[PDB]
Design a protein around this ligand. Structure first.
Ligand SMILES: CC(C)C[C@H](N)C(=O)NS(=O)(=O)OC[C@H]1O[C@@H](n2cnc3c(N)ncnc32)[C@H](O)[C@@H]1O
Ligand SMILES: [Zn+2]
Ligand SMILES: [Zn+2]
Length: 814
């Protein structure tokens, strides 16, 4: 008897499914129900591996399942082809970005097609094409008109490797999101920002309902960081003015022993005593000579000048000195702060140096703070020496003080967020050009909507587009030299481009109307497919793409183009696929493993010595090598950098697509990480071989049998099989809906065993034929090629036309 052979049959069914267009999505979902199944589109910066395929196979499983149930399914694929990812990869190998991108796209398509993944390719989008980015420019103009896009000068994050500024979200642990080994630096530049802080409250509040993993919600809440602050008024002794001071710690008001004004604050010179005017003016002048960076410095000695003026602390009614000092920036709050040395380390050091009072008003839980205080206590505690507030917990105390201040007209509550506006401009060539013009007379002028797109100059010299500090477009007068759309005189086009995350913040909407050349998309089409019912992608995008996208959707909603305010109704973050990786030789002596420098560095750990227990605990193992030594192996995230990627092409050629699909889907719960292993591959083979063998063994008998029968007339093992069949259907259906793919496969393995057990006692019967029929249908989402192959041995149409088996509730009773 022949055995399962993946060769040839997979290519046959892949072409069949494509020709039939089973996964083509309707422009507008017929009244039967729709399912928008989306996977995060890839950066075409390299070859796809089984890691990417876990994410994309998960999407295909759900898409096939929903399509079989009768839903109109939108399951699209596209290319996040602009920005740093694509250009950094192309430039590393001295290749032109446009050539590199399309060659990579061609390869990615093959990898997806070879795995039996089906998308509605008619909705494909490539962000680096004018047909797409012209709409990025369109949206940019709308934000400009609505006060959400602006130009400002200030300190920004910069990566010397990318040779461009980076947004706050693109800085991970002080390192570049692309160059994890390169520390980000600071610079002073005038850039473009998107006022995402204008939606901070809605971004925070709208998280509550969301069917997203709590871990992602928590990361976004922490990133936004809503804070309870206050503006407090301090009356100046003998003067009319009451100095407004902003603080994030109103709970420490009773401990404010002095005020500090930024050198540039108008009141610094105005309030200076006559005898102090000379020293104050000199200090203010010296401060201005410094650069933003210089004053934004860290370890510089504390300096300052007493203005010779006093203010009254509104809470204690006590007199406190007013000083001006370099460590206070005018841009922070109101440019004036209340110093609380006991609870602010910066204030502590200044107080200690200039002999200013230090008063404790927040007590530390457990062991009380010592006297004298050797350093500030900045954590929450219990209010003390704070009049009627004594005994109140710090956090709640903030609210109480604010309520008191407002009631007495001494100040007002002021909410702030840690979230900062989004820096979108980049000094790179491969990106969307900013649709703005700089006129010497008019200032910054927007490009007319009708003139879009503002095409990227076709630079062919690779050495030319390479980033050296300024935007490559700054060396092309043929591009920027233009006329002002307002006055008509000579002007200069903006030379910076939009970061890649701009493109990806709305691509899922373009999929609903990929060919519209008048609007980014037609509201009617988008509102029919939105919101995304199930989005699948990595958690690494928690405060990047997953945050920016919500902002874009809320903005487009406010424009009246999108009905929903949340783009992804359901989000599932898949665990990473890992691969056993050799980190190098080690030496063992007793319970201690010595790690030579090369090995330690590859492992990226500080230990030069690990115990055998440490090695086990981190999931590593020591394997004898032919070089006569022992090497330390450990599962590492599958990626190019690690050089441990398992590519689709070579694997499916030697093994097969369904084998790879089962290996991935059965390894572990999809939300968890998994390790790609030979044992897993062998397991996939065993399962597929066992399915084929069961059907082949009964092929002849099945052909001469009808699948019609009366359930209530079944007896013995026949009735038992009928019950197990429906128990299995229910389990597999519910598991698929919750993306519990590995357990759905376990249920099919279990039911397959039941089929073998059944046949030991019973012959091929009508109920058995129906069980086989239902089995191939339930198998289709997981191993489609084999399911389609066996299905055709007995039935005419495709599994996509068979629908999803109907559950028999009564069969579940008892
Ligand atoms: C939505 C946009 C911003 C996504 C962005 N283009 C992106 O993250 N692209 S990517 O790096 O090509 O990744 C695409 C998806 O594949 C997932 N992925 C990569 N490597 C993986 C491993 N080893 N295991 C599991 N999943 C992996 C990644 O998380 C993205 O979801
Ligand atoms: Zn970088
Ligand atoms: Zn002008």
């Amino acid at each position: 008897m022949e055995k399962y052979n993946p060769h040839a049959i997979e290519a046959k069914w892949q072409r069949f499914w494509e020709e039939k267009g089973f996964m083509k999505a309707k422009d507008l979902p017929g009244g039967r129900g729709k399912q928008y199944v989306l996977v995060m589109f890839p950066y075409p910066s390299g070859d796809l591996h089984m890691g990417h395929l876990k994410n994309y196979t998960m999407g295909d499983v759900l898409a096939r399942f929903r399509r079989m149930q009768g839903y109109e399914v939108l399951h699209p694929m596209g290319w996040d082809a602009f920005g740093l990812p694509a250009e950094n990869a192309a430039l590393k190998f001295g290749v032109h970005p446009k050539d590199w991108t399309y060659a990579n796209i061609r390869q990615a398509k093959e990898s997806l097609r070879l795995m039996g993944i089906l998308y509605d390719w008619d909705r494909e989008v490539t962000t680096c094409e004018p047909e797409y980015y012209r709409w990025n420019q369109w949206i940019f103009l709308k934000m400009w008109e609505k006060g959400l896009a602006y130009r400002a000068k200030g300190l920004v994050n910069w990566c010397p490797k990318c040779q461009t500024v980076l947004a706050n979200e693109q800085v991970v642990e002080g390192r570049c999101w692309r160059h994890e080994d390169t520390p980000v630096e600071k610079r002073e530049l005038e850039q473009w920002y998107l006022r995402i802080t204008a939606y901070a409250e809605r971004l925070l509040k709208d998280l509550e309902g969301l069917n997203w993993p709590e871990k992602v919600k928590a990361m976004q809440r922490a990133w936004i960081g809503r804070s309870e602050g206050a503006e407090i008024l301090f009356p100046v002794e003998g003067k009319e003015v009451r100095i407004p001071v902003f603080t994030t710690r109103p709970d420490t008001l009773f401990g404010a022993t002095f005020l500090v004004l930024a050198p540039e604050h108008p009141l610094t010179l105005e309030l200076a005593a006559p005898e102090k005017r000379e020293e104050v003016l000199a200090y203010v002048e010296a401060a201005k000579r410094k650069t933003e960076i210089e004053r934004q410095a860290e370890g510089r000695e504390k300096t300052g000048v007493f203005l010779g003026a006093y203010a009254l602390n509104p809470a204690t009614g006590e007199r406190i000195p007013i000083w001006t000092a370099d460590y206070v920036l005018f841009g922070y709050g109101t440019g004036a702060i209340m110093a609380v040395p006991a609870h602010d380390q910066r204030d502590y050091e200044f107080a200690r140096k200039f002999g200013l009072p230090i008063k404790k008003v927040i007590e530390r839980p457990g062991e009380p703070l010592p006297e004298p205080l050797e350093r500030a206590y900045e954590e929450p505690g219990i209010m003390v020496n704070s009049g009627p507030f004594d005994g109140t917990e710090s956090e709640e105390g903030k609210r109480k003080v604010i309520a008191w201040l407002e009631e007495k007209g001494l100040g007002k509550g002021r909410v702030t967020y840690r979230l900062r506006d989004w820096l979108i401009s980049r000094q790179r060539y491969w990106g969307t050009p900013i649709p703005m013009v700089h006129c010497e007379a008019c200032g910054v002028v927007p490009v007319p909507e009708e003139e879009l797109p503002v095409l990227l100059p076709d630079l062919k010299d690779v050495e030319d587009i390479r980033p050296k500090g300024k935007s490559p477009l700054e060396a092309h007068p043929e591009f920027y030299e233009t006329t002002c759309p307002k006055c008509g005189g000579p002007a200069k086009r903006d030379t910076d481009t939009m970061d890649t995350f701009f493109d990806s913040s709305w691509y899922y909407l373009r999929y609903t109307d990929p060919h519209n050349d008048r609007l980014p998309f037609d509201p009617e089409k988008a509102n029919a497919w939105m919101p995304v019912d199930q989005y699948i992608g990595g958690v690494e995008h928690a405060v990047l793409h997953l945050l920016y996208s919500r902002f874009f959707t809320k903005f487009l909603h406010d424009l009246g183009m999108v009905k929903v305010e949340e783009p992804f109704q359901g989000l599932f973050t898949q665990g990473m696929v890992l691969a056993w990786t050799d980190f190098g030789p080690v030496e063992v002596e007793g319970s201690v493993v010595r790690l030579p420098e090369p090995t330690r560095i590859r492992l990226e750990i500080p230990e030069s010595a690990l115990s055998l227990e440490d090695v086990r605990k981190m999931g590593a193992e020591l394997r004898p090598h032919e070089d006569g030594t022992l090497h330390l192996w450990k599962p590492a995230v599958m990626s190019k950098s690690k050089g441990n990627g398992v590519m689709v092409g070579p694997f499916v050629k030697e093994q097969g697509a369904d084998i790879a699909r089962i290996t991935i889907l059965f390894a572990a719960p999809p939300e968890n990480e998994m390790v790609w292993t030979e044992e897993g591959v062998q397991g996939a083979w065993r399962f597929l071989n066992r399915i084929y063998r069961r059907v082949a063994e009964d092929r002849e008998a099945l052909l001469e049998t009808s699948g019609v029968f009366q359930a209530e007339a079944l007896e013995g093992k026949d009735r038992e099989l009928y019950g197990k069949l429906h128990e299995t259907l229910k389990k597999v259906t519910e598991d698929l809906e919750a993306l519990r793919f590995n357990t759905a496969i376990a249920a099919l393995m279990e039911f397959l065993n039941a089929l073998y057990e059944y046949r030991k006692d019973r012959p091929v019967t009508p109920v058995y034929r129906t069980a086989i029929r239902y089995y191939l249908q339930m198998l289709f989402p997981f191993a489609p090629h084999l399911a389609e192959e066996l299905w055709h041995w007995f039935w005419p149409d495709s599994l996509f036309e068979a629908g999803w088996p109907e559950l028999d509730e009564k069969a579940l009773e008892k």
